[PDB]
Amino acid sequence: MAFWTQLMLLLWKNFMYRRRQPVQLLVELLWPLFLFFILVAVRHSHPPLEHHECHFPNKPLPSAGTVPWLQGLICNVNNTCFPQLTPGEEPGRLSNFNDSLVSRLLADARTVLGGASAHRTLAGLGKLIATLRAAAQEPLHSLLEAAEDLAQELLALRSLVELRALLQRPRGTSGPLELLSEALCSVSPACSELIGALDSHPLSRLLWRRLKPLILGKLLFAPDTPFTRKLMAQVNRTFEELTLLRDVREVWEMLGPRIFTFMNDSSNVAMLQRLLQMFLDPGSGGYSWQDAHADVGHLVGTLGRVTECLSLDKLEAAPSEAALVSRALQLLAEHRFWAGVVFLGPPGHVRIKIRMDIDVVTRTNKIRDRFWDPGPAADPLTDLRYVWGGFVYLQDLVERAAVRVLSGANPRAGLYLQQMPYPCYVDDVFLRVLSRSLPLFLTLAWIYSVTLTVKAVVREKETRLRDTMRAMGLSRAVLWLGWFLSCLGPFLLSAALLVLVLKLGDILPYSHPGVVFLFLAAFAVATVTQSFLLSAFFSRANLAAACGGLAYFSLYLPYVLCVAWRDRLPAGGRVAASLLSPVAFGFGCESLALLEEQGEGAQWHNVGTRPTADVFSLAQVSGLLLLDAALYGLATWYLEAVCPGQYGIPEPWNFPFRLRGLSLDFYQGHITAFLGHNGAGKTTTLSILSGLFPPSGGSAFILGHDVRSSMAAIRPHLGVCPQYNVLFDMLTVDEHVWFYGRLKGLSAAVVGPEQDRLLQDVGLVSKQSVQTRHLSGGMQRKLSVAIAFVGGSQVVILDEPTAGVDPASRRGIWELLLKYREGRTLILSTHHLDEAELLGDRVAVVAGGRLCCCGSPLFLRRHLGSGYYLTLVKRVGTPQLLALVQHWVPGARLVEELPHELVLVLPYTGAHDGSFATLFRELDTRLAELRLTGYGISDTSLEEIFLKVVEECAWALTRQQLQALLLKRFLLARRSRRGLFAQIVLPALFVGLALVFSLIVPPFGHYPALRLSPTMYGAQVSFFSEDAPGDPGRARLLEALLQEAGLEEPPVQHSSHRFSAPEVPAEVAKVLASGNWTPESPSPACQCSRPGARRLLPDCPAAAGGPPPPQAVTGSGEVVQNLTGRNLSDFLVKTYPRLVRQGLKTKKWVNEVRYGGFSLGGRDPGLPSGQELGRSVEELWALLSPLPGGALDRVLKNLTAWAHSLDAQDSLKIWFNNKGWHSMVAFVNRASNAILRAHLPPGPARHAHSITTLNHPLNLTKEQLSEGALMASSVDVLVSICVVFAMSFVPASFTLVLIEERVTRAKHLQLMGGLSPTLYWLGNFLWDMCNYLVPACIVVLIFLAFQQRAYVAPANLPALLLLLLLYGWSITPLMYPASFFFSVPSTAYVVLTCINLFIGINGSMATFVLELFSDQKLQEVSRILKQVFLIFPHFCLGRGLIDMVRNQAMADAFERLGDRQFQSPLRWEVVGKNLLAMVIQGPLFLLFTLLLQHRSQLLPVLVLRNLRLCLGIPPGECFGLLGVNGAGKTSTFRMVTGDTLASRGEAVLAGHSVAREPSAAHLSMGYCPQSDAIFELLTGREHLELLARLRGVPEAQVAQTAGSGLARLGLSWYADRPAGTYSGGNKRKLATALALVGDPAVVFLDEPTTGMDPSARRFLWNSLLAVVREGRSVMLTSHSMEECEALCSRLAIMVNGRFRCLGSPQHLKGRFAAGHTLTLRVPAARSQPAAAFVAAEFPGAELREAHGGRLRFQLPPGGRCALARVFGELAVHGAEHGVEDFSVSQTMLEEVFLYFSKDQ
């Protein structure tokens, strides 16, 4: 098994990283349970409320009468909404009050006092024409008969008992308004008395509270012409007839004493002998006197003082409308205003306009509501404002008067309003918005797992360790499938444990959790392969965490701005904005929440069917999410093939079409080195041999071991060791050998002893359970070279296997390699030549892309070496030494004449003659008198051969230095067109977007708009239903109503044909005509909300309400349905939820289709005889007419009028729909206009004249403008927050330049080597304001670019310009110290943006101290007075309130000057501008704090004495340093040199103390760090020149010294900006050498020693001696061997702070050494007898190396084991013992240094 064990290993790895971090795993599983245990608690504190079916009673308008109007004003003040239909919704019946006391009184009075007994009463009274008396047996007889017959008829015994009972009561707590409210309807000195009386009952004051404007307030009418007075006399005729209740008290008081004075004299004389002569009724006549006049006077004593509280006058003229507004606002604060009629226009058209208050008329900027509420919108206070405010009670007083004036012919048709019935429903505000708050709460709940998958995928690539698996045989199918199946772990487990929360905490009940899980487990396979695609762009694992969450939440906001404008969203633009995955979950979630409002959720059998018409099902959403996963991790398997990163080869425009060599021969037993050049030759050959790309780039084409193109054969034979430590962090040491063992062939049982063998051979068997985070940095590299040898490899390619390693571990690595070579082949390729000399074999070098030479280093020394050299160890005279050297062989030379030593150049042919022992036996006899203590031998070093064979194939002088900083910062600005100008464009873009976003919201206070009342809703349905057609008059009004609706006049063709039913469906017919119904019968029922099946509106079958009624269509688009003789409160209930169904998709601006309609019909069917009472009063008008109209006969006129005008009244119910806000008055207006064009004589279609009304509320006041304005003044707060955020943004781009430039070169070379901090640390500020000034102005002009804030004038922006100029002068010092305190590289950018956002949100909540409430003791004023002073220490926030208050003052002055008189502008005044200038004009103090950080240098010659280090280092002499570091060695030199602090003891810093003498401490010490001291982005020598010319130049030494640095550095021939590997530390050290032209001081420096090729290091280690040769100090740090051999002296090594050694390297090689090295080449069939010969001549001479004929021998000094004999006998006796060619040297002191490595 190959794939299915690579997958098990690659999936066990991800499980082991996911197990060792159990706060990653626990937090990412309890975080989506702190987001969905908030929704469970917001659900259980807003439960659904379910309401029954409301049927409402009717509200008659004053056209109906004055007793029905007052009954429907006082009684049904509440809109009770009965569940059974009221008696005023059924056809014919009109008034639902025929059991109250008033209506029974009028009924009995009309049926008795107009009855048939009054007929014979008037017949008896007609006999009195005789001359008897002017006020006889037979007229007395007839009158007695008739009156006695009528006596029992007035014993009506059913209402008058109740009236006498109600009037004669004790007082009680019955208020003077609650007294009438038992009689009307059953289930100002005179006003102020009852006003005090009414307070005892809250219902009484709640009825008076809005009855008060109608009976106190006044009414005003504007243009005051003859026409207007002629009209408003008719409106005053309504309040005139209410003062006929009062003059009957006048008639009663002039009649009452006349009756009462007929007592005790007339009762005996004047009536007793006239009445009592003749049973029951003569006994009733005398039993009547006591309670007759007293009770009717007690009745009229109350009735008549109600007229005394009504004003006599309510009308009052005006000159014009502009005086009406002023007089109105005068009267309104007097508490006496009803309304103001304003007539209008310049013929017959009338243009009435009612201007009311604004707490009293409904507001007029909308015709509907934004968010559909499923109520009936019938609440008596908050949305019937036309009814209790009194708009519609005044409308059809005025309309009826205009109808009566424009036409003549007093119409009579009373109007009754009637709201429509409404079905059973539920109100559930949580689930109406769940399509908007479920996507948000799961985009945030899975944003922590998306950042963990992007972090893991990118760190498997940043650490160069996806490369070391794909170069180990692994696929790219496997690597990506192991990330898919393992990042779908927690995603698919936290989407199976929040389905329980949804179904079980009732967020989505009635659903079935299978269908919800399988829709949340296709969103989770489309967000895994999105966090892969987001990680195909990045290469850093810490930027990726902070951009994965941001680009996962930035893909959701296209759903937020797509649910808002959902109405105008075409369905193609919704199946193509579902190609972002957090949006296709939006449109599936809005369709899973439309199936909850229909009772049954997402079950298995509706998961293919769309709920409403233009929505998705759930199967189309899951299909879109899988398509949207497929083509979305299909980009990754393309995008990483054409942009792999920056290590790796691209492969553009894919289709799926699909040891040896020419040059070398590596052998089967050697340890071949490969040291050529890090150029075009070396890294390509190991790449081709390691097979990562096919070969075409020059070098060679012979396939190496088996076959280059059959790589899977030799992939289990060779192992590579890369540069990087191939090592997983959180896997322990044993599991690495296990993992790379099982991945590379070997079965699961043969891998067993392999762990034992490796962990024994590397030296790690104790710590075989430590994670490899917890390993020292040279123990990892010695493990990571041991897992190249696993599985028995043979052709092991190593690749620099010692870089950056502590030298003890570097010898451990060499021991490991030297034992692992006997049966293998090693091709290690290093730079440092000590390895290739020491552990070398046949050494091959390449140069220029081709092979240069190869062979053993002895062979290369034979045919390329110069020859032997002799050095002398100890001015006597040079030519005597020349003669002594040229005594034997005259071809020699003495190359360097030094006073300390000499070095010769001898020919190696000179020793080939056997002339060695002659030389040194004479020198053994001559060194006694040459004044020299000894000699030593040397060969040509291997680096000489290497370089030589490479040669074949290859007061004003301080202010001109601002410019030195300025051009480096200027070129930083100029060259960074790829990572910058996000510091300029971003704030202008954000301030433009913020000002554009301040356009959607209209301002407040602009209620009063003209609003033509007629029907304005557009296309609509509106019915009608004629009740009784018997009379010709109301057959005209019907036609006029239709011609109002838009119906044409009926032509002579199809004359009885305008209406026609649609097609009834047949199933409807066979379900209707089988339950035996007629249009007055109930229809089939509809199903309400069962216990456990709640739903908004009921589920109605198709035959609910009946067949469709005979409709017709107009031309304006108004369906008009004939609905005559059907049950009209059964049709309107059962067809409501199917008219409004397209508005149940979005629930915003819902066009309900049917808004109202009419219902005609004559008077109430019931009690007859409207003309009998008039006949009775007309007959009883005889004999009683004293005053013809003198306040007595007017009673008789109005009583005859009240009788005669009773039977001929029409009706109109007006059904309205209150969710349209203006339907009440639209249809009252159409009714009045249609009554007008019916009494026109020529034809009802009269096109001359027409009533219109408007609705224009009255001018607002100061607390009415300002309160609504400050409530609306919140989008400008968002504008201000965006302004302060975007303008605080770009200094966080400024400080990035200082983040990686803290201390690294400028602070510790440019400011310390010559001590100039004074310019630099304020010149950063100067350059920041210099390059802030233009991104200030370029943000200033975005105000002007969009006409949304700027508005050109001196009053706005004379100082906001200066405000936006001083922001960056202020903000610059207070946010530098993220750089030079708590150094973090490019990671606290999130922190800096967050803290500026925290400043902005403190400024945001600063001014919002008030929302609705306030307290008593000036606490808000004290809090805003404290925030006035709170701007003192916070320069980022004080402005953030001044911009707010300045915008408010701007708009305040604009309003108060464009509405009222002229006030002073305050553009510069103290409360906004001068105090802010005084606050902000001190950032130099913060600049001094920032520079005082540098004056403390931080956030707030060598004598060592037991710090047993007995070290004396004198200045002026070079000193060496080797050994180990990191144990307290470099730190010890740091606390010597001042980087670190020591706690106890004493410290010497050049004889100067720190806290005692600051001047001597600053001036006398300069110490370069070891932290790769460079600013990486430069352009080369010219930075170095200009930092040199920061000191002492008359603008002319720049050229001289730049020419010197160009001439003396030959490494400047390359590009004007070099690459970075070519430049760097070598030019930096040459720059320091150039900087010491003015430095005669100690230059003890860390010398970082960047590991470059030795070609430039020849010039470096020559010129560092050649420049500093004056006798001053030279300091360098050695870590490899050749730089120790280049320039060293007496060297110090710390061994736990103890010295066990001391000496210069000549002293070290004299005392501590081990003699000489014999290098020898013999054939292997002769080598061990040659070793026997060596042991014969040298019994006991030590041998170190013996392999392949390569023999090395260690020769101790003393006797024959020393020099002077050995090469002589090897020339004599060793010549015939198989030796062909060999050389000797003194011991190269790596192995002498092995004792120094064994010291520790």
Ligand SMILES: CCCCCCCC/C=C\CCCCCCCC(=O)OC[C@H](COP(=O)(O)OC[C@H](N)C(=O)O)OC(=O)CCCCCCC/C=C\CCCCCCCC
């Ligand atoms: C950086 C950009 C960020 C992008 C984010 C913006 C997009 C989405 C953000 C938030 C989601 C919601 C968006 C903000 C509000 C959404 C709309 C809103 O809620 O307005 C006020 C609502 C009134 O609306 P309705 O629900 O009555 O709607 C009428 C009708 N059904 C319809 O379909 O329209 O009254 C109420 O809130 C009910 C109060 C009493 C019961 C409350 C109970 C229910 C209320 C809330 C439920 C939990 C939501 C909590 C939200 C807090 C986080 C903001």
Ligand SMILES: CCCCCCCC/C=C\CCCCCCCC(=O)OC[C@H](COP(=O)(O)OC[C@H](N)C(=O)O)OC(=O)CCCCCCC/C=C\CCCCCCCC
């Ligand atoms: C109002 C509600 C706001 C909700 C915001 C949710 C954010 C996280 C919520 C709670 C965190 C819980 C508190 C933190 C827990 C403390 C522990 C902690 O710091 O974790 C850091 C983790 C560590 O994982 P690693 O990356 O090191 O490796 C994990 C790897 N995959 C593996 O398992 O092998 O990496 C990270 O996540 C670093 C990023 C930090 C996470 C935030 C990353 C978010 C970054 C940017 C997006 C923020 C919000 C989006 C911007 C506007 C939204 C308003």
